[PDB]
Amino acid sequence: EPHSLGILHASYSRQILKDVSLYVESGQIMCILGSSGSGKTTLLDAMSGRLGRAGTFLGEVYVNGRALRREQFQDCFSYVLQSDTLLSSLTVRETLHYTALLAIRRGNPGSFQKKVEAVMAELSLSHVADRLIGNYSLGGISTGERRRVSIAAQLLQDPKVMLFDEPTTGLDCMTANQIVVLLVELARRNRIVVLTIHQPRSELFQLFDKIAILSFGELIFCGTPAEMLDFFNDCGYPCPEHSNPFDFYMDLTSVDTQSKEREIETSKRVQMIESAYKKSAICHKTLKNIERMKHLKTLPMVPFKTKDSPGVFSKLGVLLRRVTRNLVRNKLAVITRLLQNLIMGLFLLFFVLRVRSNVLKGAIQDRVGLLYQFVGATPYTGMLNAVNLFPVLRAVSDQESQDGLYQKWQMMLAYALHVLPFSVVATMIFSSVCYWTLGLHPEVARFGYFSAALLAPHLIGEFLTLVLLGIVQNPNIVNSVVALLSIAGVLVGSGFLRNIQEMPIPFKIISYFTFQKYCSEILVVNEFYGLNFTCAFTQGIQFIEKTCPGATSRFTMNFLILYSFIPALVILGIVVFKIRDHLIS
Amino acid sequence: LQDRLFSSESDNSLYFTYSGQPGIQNLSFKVRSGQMLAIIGSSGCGRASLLDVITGRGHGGKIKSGQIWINGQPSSPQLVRKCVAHVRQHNQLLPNLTVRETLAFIAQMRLPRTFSQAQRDKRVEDVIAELRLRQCADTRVGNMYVRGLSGGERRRVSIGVQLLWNPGILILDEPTSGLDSFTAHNLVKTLSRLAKGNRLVLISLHQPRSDIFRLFDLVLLMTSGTPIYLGAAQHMVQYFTAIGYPCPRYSNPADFYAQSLAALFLEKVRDLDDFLWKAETKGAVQQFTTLIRRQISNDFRDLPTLLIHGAEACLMSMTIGFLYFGHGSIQLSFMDTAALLFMIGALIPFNVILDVISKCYSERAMLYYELEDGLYTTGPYFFAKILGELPEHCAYIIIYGMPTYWLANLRPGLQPFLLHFLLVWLVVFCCRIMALAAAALLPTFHMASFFSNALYNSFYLAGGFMINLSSLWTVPAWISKVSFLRWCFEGLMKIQFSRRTYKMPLGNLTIAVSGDKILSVMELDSYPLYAIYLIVIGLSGGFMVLYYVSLRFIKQKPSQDW
Structure with a gap:
């Protein structure tokens, strides 16, 4: 009931945080104001365990008897970021149901929600509980309220020590x-409550148990507002009325550089103001209180934060249900996944009409182009799918995983897993409609194959695009590159435009490495197995041979290989993401 | 703090009566060529809107009530852009130019034809030195990505861009936002300095804090579309001592928020005062060159993009070439050699589109130029850019178009080469314009970059090779005639591979005898050698006209996208 959270002589590296020291008890508030130079944020982040870097972390933190160990931070803290991105097409109760259901293993998917209720109603958002969360523009969850929910997600963990970054801002x-x-x-x-507040008002100065200033990672005053209003006048420089006590104090607290003159002079001031209460009674006192808690054992005599959030095998199953839920309750999106592929086939169908096969005037040459386009579009549709949908999920995985909920790949797996249904329907929608309208050898089986041959690329695009979206972090680039890829690919890797066998050395090698090849050399065989055109050539095989001779026999396999890519891509993905948790801090 | 003043000139001031807009409620103004008025309203009271409303440019939904008067006249969107200078939060200064340049280059368009050059030169400095852009003088401006220039300075520069008509009025939207309080002082005091001249100054600061507060001459404090009350720095402190003030700060009260014949005389008198208030008061060619010089300078002093584009093209040529490598055992297959000739055409689009959409769309500048009045579109900008790229575009083409030609061993000597190249030129160039049109008329990088890629995916099908042409609906059949991708291909094909030229088509052991007959057999003899250039230069026309229209009739406005 008195909770203990202290710091002694803490520092960080290129040595941005210097021998800081601070005391807090449960029920209090900590207000950190940091000059634009700051350091503040850096510390707050640091303490929540966010990273542990090239350089170092000096000092130790004393939490309710005992000292904290580096490996326990995240256990015994809770963190609320500068922003609060949340999945725009769910309900508050759903996002919370999923964060909770993911974070803890207990009663049931019914009772979970009841826990949620305590959180929603403890934060006073029960009243919007089951509405479209929204982006601010799409749905109209209150831009205030959303912040609120973000907090809710931390409270499901039942911490008693909470860290909030710039949360007024x-x-x-x-x-x-x-x-x-x-x-x-x-x-x-x-x-316990800790804040880093950029530009707050003069009204709020007076609402804080403990206000404390950092300059260039060097600690200065910490204490009661009244206490500051006194002890800063113990250092001199009293702040007049019509000055904003909260703000004025900071102006003095930070050096800055409008010239060398203004610059050097001020740094001396902030040094002297620092030493001033680096020595002072109060700064002794506060220190002693952090020495007190170890020295005493008292009633609280405990730390606390969550228990078991287990089965990884089980864990992402939820993540899937969530993601599918998202992606389904978004009319915008879904329609396209399914449909565009078809759009491709219509859009072609419209120019190409049906496959004139009577003459040779418009026979092989209309089909070549057709297959070509399919093989060099059905991966495009993939990324068009991915690049547009995924970033939200990606970045939410980012901001979420940091608090400690699910490892970065979990998600990427999940996305990758749900697409299957959608893309596979798309392929069918597309195929069923177009293939017959174009009427290129129509026995159902060979349609059936043609619909499996164009499902693969439409995934390959997806998962490649996915992988890349973990490495490269600026989607619109990914969407340029993947195009270039998935077009270049077809040029070299289906026979069509340069009779692969005939092509000069190195490209030949390349081709064998592209899914394109192993798709086209299906589609060509599948659609020419044997046919007869009126007139150069004449028969179905006589073309098969010209472009891709070993296809006829190899077909059985080609599929094997064409579908071979899609486990790889995603498997790789996992690695890229498993890695990427280290990449961005 | 050092020195006082090197600019000031006179006259105008500002006047109001009972406004309202969906967000505003019954304003009334004192604004007098020497006061600085800080609007210190709540967070989005139509506050950041207010100034834009006063200019006439209204987001919210057009005004409800009111009357607006400048120095001694009504208000008018045609009027304001000749009196008042507006300084936004948004900066739109060209990355690779020196302060002195970015000023001189606007000076040459805003200062009248009559002015001497020495005048412009001295005016530039006469600004620089009043704003104390002392050692920024000949240093590049845009921190955007050179990251070699201060912000506190940068602001002052984009202000300076506006002080080249020494305007009697001056309106600044949230100028402090971003700067450090340390410098905020040193800016707002320069604004006050300006103000001491015969400059009228309008500010809007939603979170001003105390210190900057102290520097206000006139203040207007409003919460969500009502004025709590107008007044000077000191007076406010006292005036809201009709309801009693506190210890913290000057914005606290912002948070807290004829009848008697005696008055009848005052009513009359204010009217009488009021009369007195007013009573006291009472070329394209040249532009065009400037634009291309500035436009072309920056773009040429940009190396990073420039190396890439070269690379970006170069490599395509390399690969395309190798892939159809015309020497060595393997022989170009007439079957195949067409393909190349098509590709070389209908490939580069998929880069160039995005290349030039990207630029035009990453230009919002022109909006503020349109509204502020720097540039026409009569003989002015439509020509500004279309020529501006050109030199780049020529290298871009040559780098992409020569090597392919040789690698893939097309017809020897020269003549063909140049007819080839020259066509590729008009094809790609037509395509640039297409993009420009697409971009200027549509309203989002993504959107224009769709309309484009659909309009392109629609032209390649029409293109000869991938679909055989003759056999078609009228709907393509007609379209194909319009397709620069097709015309590229037929052109190249006609110049290269048929014409009264002769070929050796071949498989395995063969090296056979053939000629122009081949193209006659292909449906492509249809139009002649030299027609096609005209068709594509004509096609260009169509898009060009779409650009000239989309600019002249339709705004380009800001998008966040790329």
């Missing part, structure tokens, strides 16, 4: 305060 007169309140209330509910 990006709001308005009314809302900011409304949010601040709720922080403080959480403090009322026997919690």
